[PDB]
Amino acid sequence: QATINIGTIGHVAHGKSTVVKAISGVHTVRFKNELERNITIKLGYANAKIYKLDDPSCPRPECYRSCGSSTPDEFPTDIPGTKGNFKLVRHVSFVDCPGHDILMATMLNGAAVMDAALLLIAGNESCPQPQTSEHLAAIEIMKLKHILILQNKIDLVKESQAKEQYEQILAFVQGTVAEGAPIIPISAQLKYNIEVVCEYIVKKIPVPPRDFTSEPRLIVIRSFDVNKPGCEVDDLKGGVAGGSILKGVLKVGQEIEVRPGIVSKDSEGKLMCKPIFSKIVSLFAEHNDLQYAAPGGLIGVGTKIDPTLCRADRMVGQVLGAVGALPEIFTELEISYFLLRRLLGVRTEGDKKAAKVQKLSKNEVLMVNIGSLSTGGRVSAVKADLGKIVLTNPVCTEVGEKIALSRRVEKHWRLIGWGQIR
Amino acid sequence: CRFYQHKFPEVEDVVMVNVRSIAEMGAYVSLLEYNNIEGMILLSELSRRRIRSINKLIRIGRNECVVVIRVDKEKGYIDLSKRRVSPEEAIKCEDKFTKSKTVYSILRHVAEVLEYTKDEQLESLFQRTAWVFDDKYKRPGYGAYDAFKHAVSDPSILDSLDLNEDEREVLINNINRRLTPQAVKIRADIEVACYGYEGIDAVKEALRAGLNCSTETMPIKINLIAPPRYVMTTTTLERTEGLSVLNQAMAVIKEKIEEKRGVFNV
Amino acid sequence: MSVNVNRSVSDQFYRYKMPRLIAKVEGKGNGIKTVIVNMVDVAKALNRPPTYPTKYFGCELGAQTQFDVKNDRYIVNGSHEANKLQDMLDGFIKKFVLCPECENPETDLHVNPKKQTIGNSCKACGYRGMLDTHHKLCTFILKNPPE
RNA sequence: AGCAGAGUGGCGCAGCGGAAGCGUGCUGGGCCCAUAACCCAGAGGUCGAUGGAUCGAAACCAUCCUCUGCUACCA
RNA sequence: CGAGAUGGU
């Protein structure tokens, strides 16, 4: 399955494809009859292995040469060793986090399903790049301290401008996160130095505690593969959920449920909403089928549901567990909150409305996030630090420790702060 | 040879013709449903309004639709007109001609049996079977093409008379080589997406309950434009008969999930 | 080749881009035609009916124009090769839908044909009003409202 | 993947179960003192593979191939 | 009461 799961995180115009291939061998993609843009804009994945010879290097699947293919005019090459037998370090897979702040709820969810972060940096915009606070301040508030930095698109950038970038970032983080994350430089075009990223995901990142025998918990985000061909057109395979198990051993034929579920038809409102549950039909990980599974790793879980739920990611940010589980389900929320010391998202040569956030009012709709879920929140009562709200879809958590808060401060919502349940 | 019952055309009806020459008073023409007999279109009968050139109304070797305005039976004189013909009547003329050319393409080929020395065999093969198969129906408006279509579904039409084996097989083939694509002409459209958490077991009745009392071998054909747009074929029946099976299938498709705690728009 | 929608702006990164407009000169003297070949694709790229940009050339040049459903040819009568259109190919933007506050033709029209008025609105800075009363094409637009 | 088009004889639009189909473009001739309008005539010819009825196959019917178009998915 | 514009030596 896996020992750890790592989120590749960044900002607009930094690229994706070359570096996600360099750390895994897998092209991150979403299927569309259209050209591939500079970024995978919405949350994805890349399956991987990490392995070495007897001496520090990251080989190809043929071990004798590191020979590249990312540039048409050159063959950059080194010898890891004289065709030595490879050794696996540990089982790992990557969470391909969103490329634009428009998906900030899905980004907080991606940052919750990872055990650690890779934060990606590029020369395409001015030095004090703001997502170095925006991700890492939320990541500290969701208590996930495990962080690394990766300087990607610098193929034509001088060492003094590469310095000015990391040094204006090192000055900027003083109010938002600890400086203690290592930086790895690479080439995006030449695949130079990329095996140091592999070494640092062994060097910096610990294996986290989980309970192997306590009651099942799972986070789901992805509608996994089901396909059109068949002699029976309905329910040939059933819908498959992509997720990561938080807690408990899991097995084929176990009854599993999703906590927020759905609102029942012919209800007059938020009443009569219920969980949804079924027996697990199959399991998938590491390009193999399974009968059993464990906490701490990315997995595909097979279910009896209609594939019409799976033709798109309807299942973004959902919490799952054993049938009839305890954890409280919220369709309305009691909140206490705090706001960021600057407005955030983009920057240039001098101030662009970067002042402190204006207080909330009841005539508005929030986007609000809890655990690894998301919902839209409408106000019943509020003050500048405290409130009471009703939710357009239900949400769930094992404890009400934290929430994250986004406001329509302009045409689409931006993060403005965080809070707790009362 | 002649395609029809009678020696000469009747007055004030439409014939298919081919143009041979143009002169000072009119164009000279051969009628096609008769044995290439001579007739003429007068230049006064071509248009209701001024003519910019004649060559773009008529040119030699092209097929044309015209009414017969006068006939003298004894001398063999026939007068033709184009000013009269409406476009519905031109479509009707092409249907009469196509239904006749197909029947004639059977009989001309069936005649290549016995001695076949003279057109006497063509006229002898046209008489009896093919003539009594449509002389009875001139007023209703059918031709022997419909009797041949009846002889395809039941050969008792042929068994009623003196017969030849080419006259059986060539007749059948000139329908069946074109009629054998008796293709699908009805399918259903359904908006259903399924609530059932037991669906991979439960929906296998809704996929198979669509008709009662079949053989266990009986197929149906099922289709999909996208997952929320389900489609089914009504047991390969034609659009003149499958309308009952269409209404039953869509009702059964919704029933075998509304029976199972689903709810949908009727 | 391809171009910016208007050449009064020299910027490589300008928001508006389109295919070339190419035309055939046809016939002989005392009876010459200029036929525009790309006109349906250019009208689709500019989000207008193909009658309006064709009619604007006849209004400026002092010439007859033809439209035909039987053959899909759009025609400006007389010879108008090279510079005779290409000095003024901007005009359908430059005399109608440039905002006076900023050089950004992200601009829409709405017609009230019962009340002799054409409404105008640009998304770039919120500029709104009507088309001009001395300008030619207003008499054609009110008799030919948009789809 | 559901449904549709194309597979020149001359640019381009693709007729109908008869060997160009018609409106149009090109080239030449007539008419006029001459140019346009109008009139007339030209252009070397199995139109992707494999079967079958025909006097006949780009155009009556199967089975494969490929790209577009609208829906919209094995990816 | 069809259609019938124009003009380097």
Side-chain angles (χ1 to χ4, degrees), chain A residues 41-66:
Chain A
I41 192 161
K42 193 170 182 176
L43 174 58
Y45 66 93
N47 301 147
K49 285 183 172 67
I50 181 158
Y51 53 88
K52 57 168 60 175
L53 304 195
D54 303 338
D55 211 4
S57 176
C58 185
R60 289 190 307 154
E62 290 193 320
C63 53
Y64 200 1
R65 282 180 172 129
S66 65

mmCIF file of all heavy atoms in Angstrom, chain A residues 41-66:
data_model
loop_
_atom_site.group_PDB
_atom_site.id
_atom_site.type_symbol
_atom_site.label_atom_id
_atom_site.label_comp_id
_atom_site.label_asym_id
_atom_site.label_seq_id
_atom_site.Cartn_x
_atom_site.Cartn_y
_atom_site.Cartn_z
ATOM 1 N N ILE A 41 -4.683 21.993 -12.985
ATOM 2 C CA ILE A 41 -5.280 23.054 -12.156
ATOM 3 C C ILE A 41 -5.987 22.523 -10.894
ATOM 4 O O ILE A 41 -5.992 23.210 -9.872
ATOM 5 C CB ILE A 41 -6.198 23.946 -13.026
ATOM 6 C CG1 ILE A 41 -6.579 25.222 -12.251
ATOM 7 C CG2 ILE A 41 -7.460 23.213 -13.518
ATOM 8 C CD1 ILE A 41 -7.095 26.358 -13.144
ATOM 9 N N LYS A 42 -6.510 21.290 -10.936
ATOM 10 C CA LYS A 42 -7.304 20.638 -9.881
ATOM 11 C C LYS A 42 -6.627 19.352 -9.375
ATOM 12 O O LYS A 42 -5.844 18.730 -10.091
ATOM 13 C CB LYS A 42 -8.734 20.431 -10.419
ATOM 14 C CG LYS A 42 -9.763 20.045 -9.343
ATOM 15 C CD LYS A 42 -11.187 20.111 -9.914
ATOM 16 C CE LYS A 42 -12.219 19.772 -8.832
ATOM 17 N NZ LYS A 42 -13.606 19.925 -9.338
ATOM 18 N N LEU A 43 -6.912 18.987 -8.124
ATOM 19 C CA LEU A 43 -6.248 17.926 -7.350
ATOM 20 C C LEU A 43 -6.212 16.560 -8.071
ATOM 21 O O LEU A 43 -7.242 16.062 -8.526
ATOM 22 C CB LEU A 43 -6.963 17.870 -5.985
ATOM 23 C CG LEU A 43 -6.573 16.756 -5.005
ATOM 24 C CD1 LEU A 43 -5.093 16.753 -4.645
ATOM 25 C CD2 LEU A 43 -7.311 16.971 -3.685
ATOM 26 N N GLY A 44 -5.029 15.948 -8.151
ATOM 27 C CA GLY A 44 -4.755 14.668 -8.816
ATOM 28 C C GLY A 44 -3.800 13.773 -8.016
ATOM 29 O O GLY A 44 -3.772 13.825 -6.782
ATOM 30 N N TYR A 45 -3.012 12.942 -8.700
ATOM 31 C CA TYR A 45 -2.074 11.986 -8.089
ATOM 32 C C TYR A 45 -0.932 11.580 -9.040
ATOM 33 O O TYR A 45 -1.024 11.773 -10.252
ATOM 34 C CB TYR A 45 -2.839 10.736 -7.618
ATOM 35 C CG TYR A 45 -3.448 9.902 -8.733
ATOM 36 C CD1 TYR A 45 -2.729 8.819 -9.279
ATOM 37 C CD2 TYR A 45 -4.726 10.217 -9.235
ATOM 38 C CE1 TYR A 45 -3.276 8.071 -10.339
ATOM 39 C CE2 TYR A 45 -5.282 9.465 -10.285
ATOM 40 C CZ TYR A 45 -4.552 8.393 -10.846
ATOM 41 O OH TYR A 45 -5.072 7.675 -11.876
ATOM 42 N N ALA A 46 0.125 10.967 -8.495
ATOM 43 C CA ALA A 46 1.134 10.225 -9.261
ATOM 44 C C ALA A 46 1.699 9.048 -8.440
ATOM 45 O O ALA A 46 2.331 9.249 -7.401
ATOM 46 C CB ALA A 46 2.241 11.187 -9.721
ATOM 47 N N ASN A 47 1.462 7.814 -8.897
ATOM 48 C CA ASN A 47 1.990 6.599 -8.268
ATOM 49 C C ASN A 47 3.506 6.461 -8.501
ATOM 50 O O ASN A 47 4.018 6.865 -9.546
ATOM 51 C CB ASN A 47 1.218 5.364 -8.778
ATOM 52 C CG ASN A 47 -0.282 5.375 -8.511
ATOM 53 O OD1 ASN A 47 -1.064 4.863 -9.295
ATOM 54 N ND2 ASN A 47 -0.751 5.949 -7.425
ATOM 55 N N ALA A 48 4.235 5.900 -7.533
ATOM 56 C CA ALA A 48 5.696 5.997 -7.474
ATOM 57 C C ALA A 48 6.360 4.819 -6.730
ATOM 58 O O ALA A 48 5.702 4.004 -6.078
ATOM 59 C CB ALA A 48 6.039 7.334 -6.800
ATOM 60 N N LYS A 49 7.693 4.769 -6.814
ATOM 61 C CA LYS A 49 8.600 4.026 -5.924
ATOM 62 C C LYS A 49 9.832 4.890 -5.650
ATOM 63 O O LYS A 49 10.225 5.679 -6.509
ATOM 64 C CB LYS A 49 9.039 2.685 -6.550
ATOM 65 C CG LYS A 49 7.956 1.596 -6.522
ATOM 66 C CD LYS A 49 8.513 0.282 -7.097
ATOM 67 C CE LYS A 49 7.561 -0.906 -6.915
ATOM 68 N NZ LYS A 49 6.315 -0.766 -7.708
ATOM 69 N N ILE A 50 10.469 4.704 -4.491
ATOM 70 C CA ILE A 50 11.794 5.269 -4.198
ATOM 71 C C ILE A 50 12.791 4.162 -3.838
ATOM 72 O O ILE A 50 12.552 3.346 -2.949
ATOM 73 C CB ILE A 50 11.724 6.417 -3.169
ATOM 74 C CG1 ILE A 50 13.147 6.959 -2.930
ATOM 75 C CG2 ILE A 50 11.069 6.021 -1.834
ATOM 76 C CD1 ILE A 50 13.164 8.379 -2.375
ATOM 77 N N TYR A 51 13.916 4.135 -4.548
ATOM 78 C CA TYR A 51 14.932 3.086 -4.497
ATOM 79 C C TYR A 51 16.326 3.664 -4.775
ATOM 80 O O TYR A 51 16.470 4.757 -5.332
ATOM 81 C CB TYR A 51 14.573 1.964 -5.491
ATOM 82 C CG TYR A 51 14.316 2.441 -6.906
ATOM 83 C CD1 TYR A 51 15.382 2.560 -7.815
ATOM 84 C CD2 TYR A 51 13.010 2.789 -7.300
ATOM 85 C CE1 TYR A 51 15.151 3.074 -9.101
ATOM 86 C CE2 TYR A 51 12.775 3.304 -8.588
ATOM 87 C CZ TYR A 51 13.853 3.466 -9.482
ATOM 88 O OH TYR A 51 13.648 4.019 -10.703
ATOM 89 N N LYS A 52 17.358 2.919 -4.378
ATOM 90 C CA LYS A 52 18.780 3.290 -4.464
ATOM 91 C C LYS A 52 19.640 2.101 -4.897
ATOM 92 O O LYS A 52 19.180 0.958 -4.870
ATOM 93 C CB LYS A 52 19.243 3.870 -3.110
ATOM 94 C CG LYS A 52 19.034 2.904 -1.930
ATOM 95 C CD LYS A 52 19.745 3.343 -0.642
ATOM 96 C CE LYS A 52 19.268 4.707 -0.127
ATOM 97 N NZ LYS A 52 19.889 5.032 1.181
ATOM 98 N N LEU A 53 20.887 2.366 -5.286
ATOM 99 C CA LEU A 53 21.945 1.349 -5.242
ATOM 100 C C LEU A 53 22.634 1.362 -3.858
ATOM 101 O O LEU A 53 22.126 1.946 -2.901
ATOM 102 C CB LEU A 53 22.927 1.559 -6.417
ATOM 103 C CG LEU A 53 22.297 1.559 -7.822
ATOM 104 C CD1 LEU A 53 23.408 1.403 -8.859
ATOM 105 C CD2 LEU A 53 21.310 0.413 -8.045
ATOM 106 N N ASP A 54 23.803 0.736 -3.742
ATOM 107 C CA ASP A 54 24.639 0.761 -2.529
ATOM 108 C C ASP A 54 25.282 2.139 -2.247
ATOM 109 O O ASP A 54 25.779 2.376 -1.147
ATOM 110 C CB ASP A 54 25.740 -0.308 -2.638
ATOM 111 C CG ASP A 54 25.232 -1.737 -2.873
ATOM 112 O OD1 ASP A 54 24.055 -2.042 -2.566
ATOM 113 O OD2 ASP A 54 26.028 -2.578 -3.348
ATOM 114 N N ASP A 55 25.274 3.049 -3.225
ATOM 115 C CA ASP A 55 25.888 4.390 -3.188
ATOM 116 C C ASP A 55 24.836 5.450 -3.615
ATOM 117 O O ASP A 55 24.066 5.165 -4.541
ATOM 118 C CB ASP A 55 27.115 4.366 -4.128
ATOM 119 C CG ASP A 55 28.279 5.286 -3.735
ATOM 120 O OD1 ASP A 55 28.229 5.934 -2.667
ATOM 121 O OD2 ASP A 55 29.275 5.341 -4.494
ATOM 122 N N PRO A 56 24.726 6.638 -2.976
ATOM 123 C CA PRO A 56 23.607 7.568 -3.189
ATOM 124 C C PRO A 56 23.392 8.035 -4.641
ATOM 125 O O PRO A 56 24.183 8.802 -5.195
ATOM 126 C CB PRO A 56 23.872 8.759 -2.256
ATOM 127 C CG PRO A 56 24.677 8.143 -1.123
ATOM 128 C CD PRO A 56 25.526 7.103 -1.847
ATOM 129 N N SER A 57 22.288 7.590 -5.247
ATOM 130 C CA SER A 57 21.744 8.042 -6.538
ATOM 131 C C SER A 57 20.300 7.522 -6.704
ATOM 132 O O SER A 57 19.895 6.603 -5.987
ATOM 133 C CB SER A 57 22.652 7.565 -7.681
ATOM 134 O OG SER A 57 22.129 7.881 -8.955
ATOM 135 N N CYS A 58 19.522 8.082 -7.642
ATOM 136 C CA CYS A 58 18.185 7.593 -8.020
ATOM 137 C C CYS A 58 18.170 7.059 -9.473
ATOM 138 O O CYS A 58 18.041 7.846 -10.420
ATOM 139 C CB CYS A 58 17.166 8.719 -7.794
ATOM 140 S SG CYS A 58 15.490 8.098 -8.099
ATOM 141 N N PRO A 59 18.342 5.739 -9.694
ATOM 142 C CA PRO A 59 18.374 5.152 -11.033
ATOM 143 C C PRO A 59 17.036 5.221 -11.801
ATOM 144 O O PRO A 59 15.953 5.351 -11.221
ATOM 145 C CB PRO A 59 18.808 3.690 -10.837
ATOM 146 C CG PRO A 59 19.390 3.628 -9.429
ATOM 147 C CD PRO A 59 18.651 4.734 -8.686
ATOM 148 N N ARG A 60 17.105 5.019 -13.123
ATOM 149 C CA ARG A 60 15.974 4.571 -13.969
ATOM 150 C C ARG A 60 15.625 3.090 -13.683
ATOM 151 O O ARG A 60 16.403 2.403 -13.018
ATOM 152 C CB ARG A 60 16.378 4.769 -15.444
ATOM 153 C CG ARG A 60 16.435 6.251 -15.852
ATOM 154 C CD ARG A 60 16.584 6.424 -17.373
ATOM 155 N NE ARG A 60 17.725 5.654 -17.905
ATOM 156 C CZ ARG A 60 17.871 5.194 -19.134
ATOM 157 N NH1 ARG A 60 17.052 5.501 -20.095
ATOM 158 N NH2 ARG A 60 18.859 4.400 -19.419
ATOM 159 N N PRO A 61 14.498 2.549 -14.190
ATOM 160 C CA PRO A 61 14.169 1.127 -14.023
ATOM 161 C C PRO A 61 15.215 0.168 -14.628
ATOM 162 O O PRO A 61 15.403 -0.932 -14.109
ATOM 163 C CB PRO A 61 12.776 0.945 -14.645
ATOM 164 C CG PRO A 61 12.594 2.165 -15.543
ATOM 165 C CD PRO A 61 13.381 3.248 -14.814
ATOM 166 N N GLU A 62 15.950 0.586 -15.665
ATOM 167 C CA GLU A 62 17.265 0.007 -15.992
ATOM 168 C C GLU A 62 18.369 0.786 -15.259
ATOM 169 O O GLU A 62 18.580 1.973 -15.508
ATOM 170 C CB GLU A 62 17.508 0.011 -17.509
ATOM 171 C CG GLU A 62 16.605 -0.996 -18.239
ATOM 172 C CD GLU A 62 17.047 -1.236 -19.691
ATOM 173 O OE1 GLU A 62 17.441 -0.271 -20.386
ATOM 174 O OE2 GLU A 62 16.995 -2.399 -20.151
ATOM 175 N N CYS A 63 19.071 0.125 -14.339
ATOM 176 C CA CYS A 63 19.866 0.774 -13.289
ATOM 177 C C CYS A 63 21.200 1.423 -13.731
ATOM 178 O O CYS A 63 21.755 2.230 -12.987
ATOM 179 C CB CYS A 63 20.103 -0.274 -12.190
ATOM 180 S SG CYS A 63 20.816 -1.797 -12.888
ATOM 181 N N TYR A 64 21.746 1.082 -14.901
ATOM 182 C CA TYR A 64 23.131 1.414 -15.281
ATOM 183 C C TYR A 64 23.354 2.896 -15.678
ATOM 184 O O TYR A 64 24.461 3.412 -15.532
ATOM 185 C CB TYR A 64 23.549 0.437 -16.401
ATOM 186 C CG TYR A 64 25.030 0.205 -16.685
ATOM 187 C CD1 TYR A 64 26.067 0.822 -15.953
ATOM 188 C CD2 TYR A 64 25.366 -0.705 -17.705
ATOM 189 C CE1 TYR A 64 27.417 0.556 -16.257
ATOM 190 C CE2 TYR A 64 26.714 -1.006 -17.987
ATOM 191 C CZ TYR A 64 27.742 -0.373 -17.262
ATOM 192 O OH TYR A 64 29.044 -0.661 -17.515
ATOM 193 N N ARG A 65 22.323 3.613 -16.153
ATOM 194 C CA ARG A 65 22.420 5.034 -16.558
ATOM 195 C C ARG A 65 21.186 5.849 -16.163
ATOM 196 O O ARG A 65 20.060 5.377 -16.291
ATOM 197 C CB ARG A 65 22.663 5.140 -18.078
ATOM 198 C CG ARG A 65 24.116 4.865 -18.502
ATOM 199 C CD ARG A 65 24.254 5.005 -20.027
ATOM 200 N NE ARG A 65 25.670 4.930 -20.453
ATOM 201 C CZ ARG A 65 26.196 4.159 -21.391
ATOM 202 N NH1 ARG A 65 25.499 3.299 -22.073
ATOM 203 N NH2 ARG A 65 27.465 4.242 -21.670
ATOM 204 N N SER A 66 21.382 7.115 -15.795
ATOM 205 C CA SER A 66 20.312 8.102 -15.530
ATOM 206 C C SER A 66 19.848 8.886 -16.779
ATOM 207 O O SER A 66 19.256 9.961 -16.656
ATOM 208 C CB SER A 66 20.770 9.056 -14.418
ATOM 209 O OG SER A 66 21.882 9.823 -14.843
#
